[PDB]
């Protein structure tokens, strides 16, 4: 829960909608469907990248500690 609450803020803070309202991103900047794809893939390579590895490592550790 702690890390989830810490990460939800970072997820929203990185949106171009907030950036163009905070002044760092110029208002005359329209996000394209390709930049959205690039950002989503960059996020995915971390989020969905770390999931199967985490599950497999935990399954292996649980099966080792259980003696199977
Ligand atoms: Zn933290």
UniProtKB/Swiss-Prot annotation:
Modifications after synthesis and translation: Proteolytic cleavage by ADAM17 generates a secreted form. Also cleaved by serine proteases: TMPRSS2, TMPRSS11D and HPN/TMPRSS1.
Binding site for Zn(2+): 3
Use in biotech settings: An engeneered stable, dimeric and secreted receptor with combined mutations that increase the affinity for human coronavirus SARS-CoV-2 spike protein shows potent SARS-CoV and SARS-CoV-2 neutralization in vitro.
Subcellular localization(s) per the UniProt record: Cell membrane; Cytoplasm; Cell projection, Cilium; Apical cell membrane
Swiss-Prot/TrEMBL induction comment: Up-regulated in failing heart. Expression is induced by IFNA and IFNG. Exposure to cigarette smoke increases expression in lungs. Expression is decreased in nasal and bronchial epithelium of individuals with allergy after allergen challenge. IL13 stimulation decreases expression in nasal and bronchial epithelium. (Microbial infection) In airway epithelial cells, expression is increased upon influenza A virus infection.
Expressed in which tissues: Expressed in endothelial cells from small and large arteries, and in arterial smooth muscle cells (at protein level). Expressed in enterocytes of the small intestine, Leydig cells and Sertoli cells (at protein level). Expressed in the renal proximal tubule and the small intestine (at protein level). Expressed in heart, kidney, testis, and gastrointestinal system (at protein level). In lung, expressed at low levels in some alveolar type 2 cells, the expression seems to be individual-specific (at protein level). Expressed in nasal epithelial cells (at protein level).
Glycosylation sites (chain numbering): 33
Function: Essential counter-regulatory carboxypeptidase of the renin-angiotensin hormone system that is a critical regulator of blood volume, systemic vascular resistance, and thus cardiovascular homeostasis. Converts angiotensin I to angiotensin 1-9, a nine-amino acid peptide with anti-hypertrophic effects in cardiomyocytes, and angiotensin II to angiotensin 1-7, which then acts as a beneficial vasodilator and anti-proliferation agent, counterbalancing the actions of the vasoconstrictor angiotensin II.
Self-association and partners: Homodimer. Interacts with the catalytically active form of TMPRSS2. Interacts with SLC6A19; this interaction is essential for expression and function of SLC6A19 in intestine. Interacts with ITGA5:ITGB1. Interacts (via PDZ-binding motif) with NHERF1 (via PDZ domains); the interaction may enhance ACE2 membrane residence. (Microbial infection) Interacts with SARS coronavirus/SARS-CoV spike protein.
Family (UniProt): Belongs to the peptidase M2 family.
Domain comment as written in the entry: The extracellular region of the ACE2 enzyme is composed of two domains. The first is a zinc metallopeptidase domain (residues 19-611). The second domain is located at the C-terminus (residues 612-740) and is 48% identical to human collectrin.
Protein name: Angiotensin-converting enzyme 2
Gene name linked to the record: ACE2
Residues of the full protein shown: 400 to 467 of 805
């Amino acid at each position: 829960f702690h890390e989830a609450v810490g990460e939800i803020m970072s997820l929203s803070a990185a949106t171009p909608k907030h950036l163009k309202s905070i002044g760092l991103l110029s208002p005359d900047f329209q996000e394209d469907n390709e930049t959205e794809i690039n950002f989503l893939l960059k996020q995915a390579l971390t989020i969905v990248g770390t999931l199967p590895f985490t599950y497999m490592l935990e399954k292996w550790r649980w099966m080792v500690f259980k003696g199977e």
